[PDB]
Amino acid sequence: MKTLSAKPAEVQHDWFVVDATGKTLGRLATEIARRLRGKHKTSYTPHVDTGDYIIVINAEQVQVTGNKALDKKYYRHTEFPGGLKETNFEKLVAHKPEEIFERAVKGMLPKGPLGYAMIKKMKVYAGSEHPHAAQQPQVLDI
Amino acid sequence: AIGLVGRKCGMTRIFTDAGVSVPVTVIEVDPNRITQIKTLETDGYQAVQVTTGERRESRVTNAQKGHFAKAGVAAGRLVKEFRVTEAELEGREVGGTIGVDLFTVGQIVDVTGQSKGKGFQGGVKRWNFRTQDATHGNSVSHRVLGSTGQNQTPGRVFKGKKMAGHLGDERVTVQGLEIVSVDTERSVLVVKGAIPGATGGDVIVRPTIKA
Amino acid sequence: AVQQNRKSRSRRDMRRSHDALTENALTVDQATGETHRRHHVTKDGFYRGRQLFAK
RNA sequence: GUGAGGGGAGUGAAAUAGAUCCUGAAACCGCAUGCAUACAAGCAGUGGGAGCACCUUCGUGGUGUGACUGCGUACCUUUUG
RNA sequence: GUACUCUGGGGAUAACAGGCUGAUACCGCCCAAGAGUUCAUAUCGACGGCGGUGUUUGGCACCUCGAUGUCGGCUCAUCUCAUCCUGGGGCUGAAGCAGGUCCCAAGGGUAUGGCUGUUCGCCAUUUAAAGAGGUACGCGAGCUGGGUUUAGAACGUCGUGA
RNA sequence: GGGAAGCCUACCUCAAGAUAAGAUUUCCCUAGGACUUUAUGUCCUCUAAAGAGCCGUUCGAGACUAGGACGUUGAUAGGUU
Ligand SMILES: [Mg+2]
Ligand SMILES: [Mg+2]
Ligand SMILES: [Mg+2]
Ligand SMILES: [Mg+2]
Ligand SMILES: [Mg+2]
Ligand SMILES: [Mg+2]
Ligand SMILES: [Mg+2]
Ligand SMILES: [Mg+2]
Ligand SMILES: [Mg+2]
């Protein structure tokens, strides 16, 4: 009984800003998911969301190593008999970087209602400016 | 593309000087009244919203009354938008009138309308299926669909299978019709060919997009 | 064709949830002051200031 | 409806002992209260667990519901299985 | 002897379909005498070797005999490329019009009849072409029942006879 | 850098349940109390707005639905000419 769990009403979330220019996608995604689930806080509980809000700036400036700029392929399938769409990483990050980051972070998050609630705490913007200026976010290293 | 909203009046023929009979369709056009102009800074796109027809004051709500009073025009029976560019927006201010003089004789256009509804229809009429034999021991199955798919692989019906259902009563656009002539004193446009919809329906005439 | 398993009472009630009834349009007559179906003749024979079956 | 049926009065220790008549259970079917439930996938439970509603010998208590979460593919026979 | 049959039982045990395997079959690759011709590794190619898929014929008996009920035809489709046409190229005994080999390419299209139950095959006439396959050799709680495989009768062979 | 009926656009239709539920124009609702657990608190008194629906005459809309037009300020349906 002595081991207590975090009260969902007493959890506070604080806003952070991460700059994604010239950073590797995998390491940044792992760090974002770790700070988004709440593993850094001492009151961490597996069934309560205690993460923080993360805003990503300069989403199109993310980089991948090797030849993954042209070989990394993203597949989607509409349940129609011939609807298998395939796209490349280059064009995708050219016109929709938010999908790239959302995929990368959702792949490393739990699958369920709690994961769906955790994924909403992440904002991704292509430009260098974000509308969440009223929440007073603090700059984060990485 | 600036267009017109007219009403199909029926079909007729027109004899040329050489004697060739040209099947034509008549579209009566009440002079459209420009209601609103949408620019980039306030809405994100440039367009012209017009209205046409006549409606009694009992059927027009207070919101539409205020909208038309702000526009300074009389209430029409319907309202339609047209996506235009800034080049086509010259001399297009609210309260104006888009007459039938927009088109010229010999122009290629596109006509959009609402097809006639046939109701719940079967496969033969909807997807041009083939009927089975009516004799040689054939059973009650005469105009049925037939087979549906494979048995165990995949073991289900694929999405998009052609089956019986509702037919007609849908937006249809026919391109490539030549305006055989326009009459301004009667405010009508007679155009070669057939257009979708029955007599009395609303149709939209626009300049061709393939030219 | 016939079912392979029973249908629980929950699914039965969920299907029956569209079987609710509805009321009719009843109004008070201006002349007789009695409740009657709208646009219908009163049971005594009166409708819209007129009287059928004169007694 | 001079019907069936029911509500009063009365008899009776007792009328949910009223003639479909001792006691009268389960499957099955209604009504009322309390909680949960209309963006989230599977033998429907189990170990945790916030909140809500009534009780109090007012608690590191009781009674109901229980969002969120880890794990988890019924029973019997016959078989190498 | 039972095809006039019946009972108790089995996927402990066969015929159809699935699974494992790839002897057989299909395709690809390496070396290469020789050949059309007197030479061009332009084009085939003996004697030998190494692999790939699971479309043929086979092997094994793991699911099904207290039932997975069909050879072909009709209607309706979906997928692969080992590409029939249309598209883009390299080489050539490519003057041009044409032909041959190989590479890329699956968007679309990809016949009507005669003879047989036919799948297949033969024939007549068209087209740019009348491709090869998988999906319980697709589809029979969608249709047909012409063939096979119940009960009747006859011929040919065998049996004294059933 | 050039480069194909291949891919993305381009053509037609659907599409904010896109729970990420978007945008634009206009219209409507501005009273008096009591109590408690002082909270978008609970009971009273006084008005029911803009609109939607029920109903009726009907359709080139339609299985039932849904959708379009009209309801004395009316040509919506029948009749008459
Ligand atoms: Mg036919
Ligand atoms: Mg499946
Ligand atoms: Mg969602
Ligand atoms: Mg919910
Ligand atoms: Mg429990
Ligand atoms: Mg064995
Ligand atoms: Mg190829
Ligand atoms: Mg070719
Ligand atoms: Mg079946």
Curated annotation (Swiss-Prot), chain A:
Record GO cellular component, one term: cytosolic large ribosomal subunit
SUPFAM superfamilies for the chain: Ribosomal protein L13 (SSF52161)
Keyword Cell cycle: no
PANTHER family according to UniProt: LARGE RIBOSOMAL SUBUNIT PROTEIN UL13M (PTHR11545:SF2), RIBOSOMAL PROTEIN L13 (PTHR11545)
Keyword Ribonucleoprotein listed: yes
HAMAP family with a match to the protein in the record: Ribosomal_uL13
Molecular function in Gene Ontology: mRNA binding; structural constituent of ribosome
Protein name: Large ribosomal subunit protein uL13
Pfam families referenced in this protein's UniProt entry, alphabetically: Ribosomal_L13
GO biological process: one example: negative regulation of translation
Family of the protein in this entry: Belongs to the universal ribosomal protein uL13 family.
Keywords, comma-separated and alphabetical: Ribonucleoprotein, Ribosomal protein
The species this protein was found in: Acinetobacter baumannii (strain AB0057)
From Swiss-Prot, chain B:
A single BP term in Gene Ontology: translation
Record's keyword annotation contains Nucleotidyltransferase: no
HAMAP family membership: Ribosomal_uL3_B
Gene Ontology molecular functions: rRNA binding; structural constituent of ribosome
Organism from which the protein derives: Acinetobacter baumannii (strain AB0057)
PTM annotation: Methylated by PrmB.
Gene name in the database record: rplC
Assembly: Part of the 50S ribosomal subunit. Forms a cluster with proteins L14 and L19.
Keywords: Methylation, Ribonucleoprotein, Ribosomal protein, RNA-binding, rRNA-binding
Described function: One of the primary rRNA binding proteins, it binds directly near the 3'-end of the 23S rRNA, where it nucleates assembly of the 50S subunit.
Lineage, broadest ranks: Bacteria, Pseudomonadati, Pseudomonadota, Gammaproteobacteria, Moraxellales
A single GO cellular-component term on record: cytosolic large ribosomal subunit
Chain spans, region Disordered: 135-154
Protein name: Large ribosomal subunit protein uL3
From Swiss-Prot, chain C:
Pfam family, one: Ribosomal_L32p
GO biological process, one term: translation
Keywords, comma-separated and alphabetical: Ribonucleoprotein, Ribosomal protein
Keyword Ribosomal protein attached: yes
Biased composition (Polar residues): 24-33
InterPro entries, alphabetized: Ribosomal_bL32, Ribosomal_bL32_bact, Ribosomal_zn-bd
A GO CC term attached to the entry: large ribosomal subunit
Region (Disordered): 1-43
Biased composition annotated in UniProt, kind: Basic residues: 6-15
Keyword check for Ribosomal protein: yes
GO molecular function, one term: structural constituent of ribosome
Protein family: Belongs to the bacterial ribosomal protein bL32 family.
Name of the featured protein: Large ribosomal subunit protein bL32
Gene for this chain: rpmF
